[PDB]
């Protein structure tokens, strides 16, 4: 979780995400986490949630 | 010089800095705007210096 937080803001740095790019996160937090919904031009974003 | 900065804040913002893209201001301040280098990883970036 808290790699999470620096995750997806290196994940913005680098300036490659493209929507060929698929995610996956480990932990079952999403909805602590900033999520803007057109910040992302259509990458596939997927996790778990409990 | 304002015009440029919200460009570039709402192009940064969702995201088109990758390799993909290349991009031109007629402005011919740039160095005493915001602008910095490390950010500037994936987006080749030119401009005019009276």
Not at 13 to 32: K, R, V
């Given at each position: 979780?808290?790699?999470?937080?620096?995750?997806?803001k290196?994940i913005l740095?680098?300036?490659?995400?493209?929507?060929?790019?698929?995610?996956?996160f480990?932990?079952?937090?999403?909805?602590a986490?900033?999520?803007?919904?057109?910040?992302?031009?259509?990458?596939?974003?997927?996790?778990?949630?409990?």
């Amino acid at each position: 979780h808290e790699t999470a937080a620096e995750i997806l803001k290196q994940i913005l740095f680098m300036g490659m995400m493209t929507e060929y790019y698929h995610y996956f996160f480990t932990t079952l937090d999403l909805f602590a986490l900033d999520l803007e919904l057109y910040r992302y031009s259509g990458v596939n974003m997927t996790g778990f949630r409990l």
